[PDB]
Amino acid sequence: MYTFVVRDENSSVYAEVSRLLLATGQWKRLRKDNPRFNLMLGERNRLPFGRLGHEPGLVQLVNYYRGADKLCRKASLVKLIKTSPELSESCTWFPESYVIYPTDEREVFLAAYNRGNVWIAKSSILISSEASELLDFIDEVHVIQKYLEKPLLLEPGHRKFDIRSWVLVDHLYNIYLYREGVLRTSSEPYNSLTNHCIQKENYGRYEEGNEMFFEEFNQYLMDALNTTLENSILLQIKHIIRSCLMCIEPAISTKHLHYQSFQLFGFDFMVDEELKVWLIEVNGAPACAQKLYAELCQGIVDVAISSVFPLASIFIKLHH
């Protein structure tokens, strides 16, 4: 049989993945620190990548890409886009961002402030028109980013939202976009944060759990704006996912490594008034929507796990 260990007890995604592996009958779970495993569902912090791939007679696979944190932290994402020629400082789908320590770019940000001047400051939140206002809050590492003052608003409700997309990158560095996304909506009309936790503090007046899925959102775009989700939004989303992961592939690829890696990502996008998509952040240990846990986790076993360890499509492959 195949053997695996579980080192992240708080992962809702891979708790389901463990279940599916056990239900196969061909996967056996070992104790956390047993080194004789085929698959590691590793911890989120200080995952010991240096101890993988040194067991004779065991092909070893891990559910995290070493070095992928550059893409999945607010501070390092801004630096990655600014300093990579593939993304460049002229990148058109990432908002104007500046890293601020409480190198640093205070003077460059002020040269942008003096030169609508509403900005947001966040880290791993304050929306202000005055730089000193949000900056004094920082010192009280953060990143200052241009707040998208003109977002696409759903009707009825005049509501703001963000789009979460789940992306699976396997050991061959195939980029798989889960066909099912979710809109994490705000139940309060926009007045010139869409986090699920903040909304549980109206909530589900318009849809269950403040979550609008792609079939309803597409039908809305057809009825309201005479277009589709694929044409107006998804092409840009697939382009952004492709650009980000192809940029860091030489740094994180395990193609010729002694161990192999896959990882599930959660891309968060913002759509503005003119159906223009902006990348907000990338989550390296994302959760799923309750309706989509079964389908996506089964796809993780099929595409990322059973592809390496065979037994006895819901993804859109982003080619490159």
Binding site: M1, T3, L30, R31, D33, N34, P35, G57
Partner: peptide, 21 residues
């Protein structure tokens, strides 16, 4: 011989103490 001996340990690892690698 190596493959079969590694197979015994890798398929019955709970019977070998983990504090003696």
């Amino acid at each position: 011989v190596d493959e079969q001996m590694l197979n015994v340990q890798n398929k019955n690892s709970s019977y070998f103490v983990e504090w003696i690698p």
